[PDB]
Design a protein around this ligand. Structure first.
Ligand SMILES: Nc1ncnc2c1ncn2[C@@H]1O[C@H](COP(=O)(O)OP(=O)(O)OP(O)(O)=S)[C@@H](O)[C@H]1O
Ligand SMILES: Nc1ncnc2c1ncn2[C@@H]1O[C@H](COP(=O)(O)OP(=O)(O)OP(O)(O)=S)[C@@H](O)[C@H]1O
Ligand SMILES: O=C(NOCCO)c1ccc2cncn2c1Nc1ccc(I)cc1F
Ligand SMILES: O=C(NOCCO)c1ccc2cncn2c1Nc1ccc(I)cc1F
Ligand SMILES: [Mg+2]
Ligand SMILES: [Mg+2]
Lengths: 282, 229, 306, 281, 229, 306
């Protein structure tokens, strides 16, 4: 059992439910439900999020460590040193080499492959929820919208659409099915991540009308302008990005095979600057 | 005494100074006595690491001269600086070849070591060719070709397909084919042949050289994947 | 006019009474209301003693653009009108741009419409004037359109003032707000939804839709069924937008409202912006001539409904 | 559930049950029971080891990833790049700065504190089972002897003593109780680890008689020569080492008190590279 | 022309050639014209780098020569290396002081600049005194003492408690008290005082140097916790 | 004597017929047995055709010391005696020092004692001679003591040869083996257990204890109870060692063995090494004079018991 007896956790600073840097057997991240009277809906949210994390043990999933109930509802996870992919790409504009960008793609795919393999749909994959831990290891986090695929079609019921629009698949936006989420919707989000990785910018930078983007993407009018990929982007990546971004969700493959395609554009993808001469004896 | 000289050179190698080291090793070879296996790698490291440091200067100065694309004293100065460091580059390599073809090539006992010295002088000639463009380029290229056509024979005769030295000769000779002569078919074919051969005796890998062997191996694979693109 | 002049004078004097603005300078009194991307607090600015509304908008933004947002908000210091909520200052702390503004103790017409059920055509007349003058003010003296007109953005007070708020003054803030969470409804004009057109003509539509919402006391978009109109799971936002774009505009019920009012909202809600009445045309409208001339204890109606 | 369906794992090289470098959603470590007919004793071993790992999620415990049954019995864990503490200290004699050594102590303690807090006694803690992952993070591994403390004294029964002698506490060696293991026995092992860290050598280097060491340590005659600590070793560490090594088990501190001390040892020492002059811009 | 010299020095700084970039700047200062804010940092950094290099070279060399605890040619002719790098160390610092007391300390266009050059003078002379153990040290220790006191007066007068230069002077003067004079009580008092007055105007941290100010601040705290421990 | 000479001749012949040794050179025939840190395989050395015993001892060791172990084992090339198992060569591959030695198809007296239950005093006489000569050989011609005498380390063959094995020839290998797993019993002399003394006198004790084990067919440590001796959970090793150190030595049962035999083992098992008989004294012992002079089909007894 993963319930942390009250008192042990030592909440500190704030970052962005709500997330604090705390203390419990070292630096940890503490995500709290600030309020005092947890509605049974916020309760099932918590129960569900914990339920999903419990099933994850993989180096590219951010490490769930335990949960607390008594003070406030909270989820404890490993602390990360270093920034989100969002922060690298759009804030400090880190000048990653293309081999690194490909590798970030690769690892992100690795974590997603692992989740889908246990039937977890993340539902909120995006730059911000991808952390470059120690600048070397991609950890996918924030499982606040994560869910496990039910074998039965009538368990679903009604959930108010939430999430960041730039990563939402057209079918999700449209919200016409009982359940428009699928492994494929996660792929689309990862598609937008490829976009940020291969271009350096978010999609639709000329449009600042929020409702317009929701409407035009859901309708099919609007889709990312793939011409904005930087010139050092391997052709295989551009293709792979366009494939993850297909409007017809089924036009998408599984992430195990997606990484297989990411392994395709990798062995001959790079060998660094120039080459290397006779290796001096140590 | 020789041992004071080799301890002085080794100590200066530990201090990341490659001028007193090269002077001490030139003073070693000027005695005209035959080296060991150990005393040789120090000489190659001194005249090799310093040469690499000199090269990096040439590469970045030449890039800063092909990125300016104007007509002023900035690139006037670049040339005045490029010919300066190139002449410095020329003086070092001529000192190496003069120290090499007068005490070591003829005065050697190990055939592996004789092949090694041919790898060293040939690599130096290839490096000289990879920068001097004009009438003087032809002779350096011919010397590099002669070095390649003599070390490769003894490698195919009396070496292992998994030895470090034969692998290093294959590596340097392949990058010679790719950069100097620009025939990537032949150099690429040679690299493929090396991959087919170096694989054969993978079982025959003793502790004396595993790190070197696999290091040249992955370098060979990286050059291959660069060139087949 | 004299009352409005006195109000402006007081605002300016209080502005001179205070100096710099920063997070330590404030004490929280109460939470006036909140939403997907912003929160509003009734606060007491400690140095000056002033009670003001403090709006926090969460944004993760580069220092260079946060400073550009602040600098662009400083234009509000000059925005002086009785149809425009007053501005005390702006700053960035922690993870949030703060806008400090004239506290309006009456609230937003959104809050009011909840307690009042439906707003009387005669009060809406005053509101319609207030909106037009304010949109005119913004347009002419500050080169800008509102962008976001709707009941929650018209604020009213004890002295009977109706002011506009949350308009698009900082262009950078507009840009930074585009990365946003999904709303639950919309007042956006169809031509904007289609990227076909962009002008004050679009703010006119939103006023139109607002009015219908405030008149009927429900939503101007997705107008009720035959039964539902007798009394007097929510449609997803994409469906709302698709409606606005592809369906006829909403309209006022037949008998309960004057023909002048029905005609007024109608010329505000014409799908094609070209054929849609403009501020000059609306200003001399039958409904506006009438309402202007009417005298209504607006301030009285307001306090009586709270 | 953590059972990995057969076929997915791709066993490769060997390292040292038996451990291979394999493949399953990236590089992993695969620890197999080579044989073909698993005795019900080897079976309960496996069941128990998996049982313990399942309860661990902490950055200083080596990451259990899942287990396989069908091909052979196997435990899959994260792969580590980089060497064991044993390898650094006694093979490549890595010249760690004292602040680093203290930090390795600190992290090792952190992982142990976490295990004891969930009532797991490791029972085979030693240099080899402490990995400096990416040279920066201590991961404690090998839970082949790990066990969970039973509330009831009669569940124990008979287990043949196994383990490396240099890290075995005198009471464990003597093996007089039904259950001579305790949190305190783990501390003693960690005590020997402090010894390797603060001295650079294993204990009893003058003695090469295996049975003699077992006999002399169990009897009280033999104990580590603390004089061999290097001179840069903070006095607080030497004391802390001698305390973890006390012969009377109850006299040994537990891991919070260990982490309570260790944290202060870092604050009671100028662990700042070497000095601090002018930082050129 | 000055601009050819500064482009040559900047180009050599891009090529990671310390001495190369460090020359051109001596030719700049030999003209005897007053520098800007920008032209000072480049030369300063070059000088600092050269100093550090020589320092390590002798220090590491000296330590290795004194870590053989025997009696042989190791710490004989091999150790003569310490007097070699020490003489090299001496030549650099004498070139600095000759370039300093003849074109820069005579006329000051900025008083903060006067604090800068006096801080550099205390840095060089104190290092030379630490390097030479014998009759020479008494002189340079007092010379650095006068230089740092002269800088400390102008720092206490007309500087900010959050400026980089006053922080750097406090840092160098504290490590001078700890290493050269070995009175860690006054160094502890000094660093604690400088750190506490550094806290006061934490709000007054413009984009010009928040990073420098807090960087020297945490370095000061680290030196304090080393010396008080 | 002539037979042993011919055997040594054949050994040297096969030695010269071979050269270097390495892991590829070998084909596994069968597993002859395993211990605490080592494994032994009957193998066929491919180049020479020779069948030999290959012992692998797992060690994680520096190249400099592995090479020192090999180099020190090369001294066995000269160790030529009919009381000493023959040596073909040594090497290191993967993670394991290999010692290649004379295959003894009779096995260890440990293996034999399992099938034979008890070994007849008359055979043990031959064994006692073999051990003494071998310990003498090692001592005088190679300056070394065995260190590890016990039933599993005396090997016997079809030709009736009794040879010693696993003795301490490489000093470095001794050192490298000290980091070891715990045994289940022990034949170590008490004076060694106490670090009080270290000589051949200690190998004599172990021979003594071995003999008692081989005679009675059980374990020398902890003797046997009154009932158990009529027929004819294991004590933990620390307890065994504590016994050896603090209790009287074991001894042979009263009637079943000759007084000469009982006296012989007794002088081997005296706690104080000083008072303990040495190789010279043991060699001229009543039990040895008798047994030497006796003629026993040892080779015959061996094959008949297998
Ligand atoms: N200056 C103010 N004076 C008084 N009340 C205010 C002020 N600003 C905001 N409020 C209250 O806070 C609530 C939030 O409304 P706004 O601040 O206009 O945000 P909003 O209109 O909800 O925008 P969205 O859709 O949530 S991003 C309203 O119900 C107002 O009554
Ligand atoms: N040359 C050999 N020929 C045939 N069998 C051998 C040979 N060498 C060893 N064996 C057998 O291999 C097993 C181990 O014998 P040893 O090598 O002497 O080790 P040990 O006596 O078991 O001591 P421990 O328990 O490993 S400390 C025994 O069963 C031997 O009979
Ligand atoms: O406030 C805004 N949107 O609502 C937040 C969602 O909750 C808002 C939106 C856009 C904008 C462009 N320039 C300023 N802008 C705003 N602010 C604002 C404007 C005028 C006044 I007077 C007071 C204000 F706070
Ligand atoms: O073999 C050994 N111990 O047994 C392993 C545990 O299973 C052993 C132990 C110590 C030793 C020192 N020098 C060699 N040493 C050994 N080897 C050995 C010696 C002589 C012969 I002839 C054949 C051999 F293999
Ligand atoms: Mg608003
Ligand atoms: Mg043995």
């Amino acid at each position: 059992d993963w319930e942390i007896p009250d008192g042990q956790i030592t909440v500190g600073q704030r970052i962005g439910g709500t997330v604090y840097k705390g203390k419990w057997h070292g630096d940890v991240a503490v995500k709290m439900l600030n309020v005092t009277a947890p509605t049974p809906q916020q309760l099932q949210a918590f129960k569900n999020e914990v339920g999903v994390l419990r099933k994850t043990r993989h180096v590219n999933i951010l490490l769930f460590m335990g949960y607390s109930t008594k003070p406030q509802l909270a989820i404890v996870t490993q602390w990360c040193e270093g920034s989100s992919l969002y922060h690298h790409l759009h804030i400090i504009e880190t000048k990653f080499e293309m081999i690194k960008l490909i590798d970030i793609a690769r690892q992100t795919a690795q974590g997603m492959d692992y989740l889908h393999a246990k039937s977890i749909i993340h539902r909120d994959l995006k730059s911000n929820n991808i952390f470059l831990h120690e600048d070397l290891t991609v950890k996918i986090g924030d499982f606040g919208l994560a869910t496990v695929k039910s074998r039965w079609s009538g368990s679903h019921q009604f959930e108010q659409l939430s999430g960041s629009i730039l990563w939402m698949a057209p079918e999700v936006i449209r919200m016409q099915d009982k359940n428009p989420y699928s492994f494929q919707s996660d792929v689309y989000a990862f598609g937008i991540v490829l976009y940020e990785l291969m271009t350096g910018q978010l999609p639709y930078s000329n449009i600042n009308n929020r409702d317009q983007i929701i409407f035009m993407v859901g309708r099919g009018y609007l889709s990312p302008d793939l011409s904005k990929v930087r010139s050092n982007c391997p052709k295989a990546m551009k293709r792979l990005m366009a494939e993850c971004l297909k409007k017809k969700r089924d036009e998408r493959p599984l992430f195990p095979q997606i990484l297989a395609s990411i392994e395709l554009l990798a062995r001959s993808l790079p060998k660094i600057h120039r080459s290397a001469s006779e290796p001096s004896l140590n | 005494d020789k041992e004071e000289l080799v301890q002085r050179a080794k100590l200066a190698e530990q201090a990341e100074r490659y001028d007193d080291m090269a002077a001490a090793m030139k003073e070693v070879t000027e005695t005209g006595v035959e080296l060991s296996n150990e005393e040789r790698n120090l000489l190659s490291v001194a005249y090799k690491n310093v040469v690499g440091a000199r090269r990096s200067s040439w590469r970045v100065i030449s890039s800063i001269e092909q990125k300016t694309e104007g007509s002023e004293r900035k690139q006037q100065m670049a040339k005045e600086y490029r010919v300066k460091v190139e002449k410095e580059l020329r003086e070092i390599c001529y000192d190496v070849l003069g120290l090499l073809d007068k005490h070591l090539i003829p005065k050697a006992s190990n055939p592996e070591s004789k092949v090694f010295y041919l790898k060293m002088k040939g690599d130096y000639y290839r490096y000289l060719a990879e920068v001097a463009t004009g009438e003087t380029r032809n002779s350096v290229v011919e010397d590099s070709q002669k070095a390649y056509q003599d070390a490769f024979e003894i490698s195919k005769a009396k070496m292992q397909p998994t030895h470090p030295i034969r692998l290093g000769l294959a590596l340097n000779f392949s990058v010679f084919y790719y950069e100097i002569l620009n025939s990537p078919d032949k150099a690429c074919q040679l690299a493929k042949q090396a991959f087919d051969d170096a694989i054969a005796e993978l079982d025959t890998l003793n502790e004396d050289s595993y790190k070197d062997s696999t290091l040249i191996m992955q370098l060979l694979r990286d050059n291959l994947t660069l060139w087949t693109s | 006019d004299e009352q409005q002049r006195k109000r402006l004078e007081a605002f300016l004097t209080q502005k001179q009474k205070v100096g710099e603005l920063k997070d330590d300078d404030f004490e929280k009194i109460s939470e006036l209301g909140a939403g997907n991307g912003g929160v509003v607090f009734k606060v007491s600015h400690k140095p000056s003693g002033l009670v003001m509304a403090r709006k926090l908008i969460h944004l993760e933004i580069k220092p260079a653009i946060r400073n550009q947002i602040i600098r662009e908000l400083q234009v509000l210091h000059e925005c002086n009108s009785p149809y425009i909520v007053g501005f005390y200052g702006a700053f960035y702390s922690d993870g949030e741009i703060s806008i400090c503004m004239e506290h309006m103790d009456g609230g937003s017409l959104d809050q009011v419409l909840k307690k009042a059920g439906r707003i009387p055509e005669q009060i809406l007349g005053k509101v319609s004037i207030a909106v037009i003058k304010g949109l005119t003010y913004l347009r002419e003296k500050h080169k800008i359109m509102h962008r976001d007109v709707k009941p929650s953005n018209i604020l009213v007070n004890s002295r009977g003032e109706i002011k506009l708020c949350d308009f698009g003054v900082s262009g950078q803030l507009i840009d930074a707000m585009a990365n946003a969470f999904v709303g639950t409804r919309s007042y956006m004009s169809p031509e904007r939804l289609q990227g076909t057109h962009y002008s004050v003509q679009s703010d006119i539509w939103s006023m139109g839709l607002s009015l219908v919402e405030m008149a009927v006391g429900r939503y101007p978009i997705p107008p009720p069924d035959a039964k539902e109109l007798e009394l007097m799971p929510p449609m997803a936002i994409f469906e709302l937008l698709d409606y606005i774009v592809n369906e006829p505009p909403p309209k006022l019920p037949s008998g309960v409202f004057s023909l002048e009012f029905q005609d007024f909202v109608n010329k505000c809600l014409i799908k094609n912006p070209a054929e849609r009445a403009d501020l000059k045309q609306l200003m001399v409208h039958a409904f506006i001539k009438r309402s202007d001339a009417e005298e209504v204890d607006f301030a009285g109606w307001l306090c009586s409904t709270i």
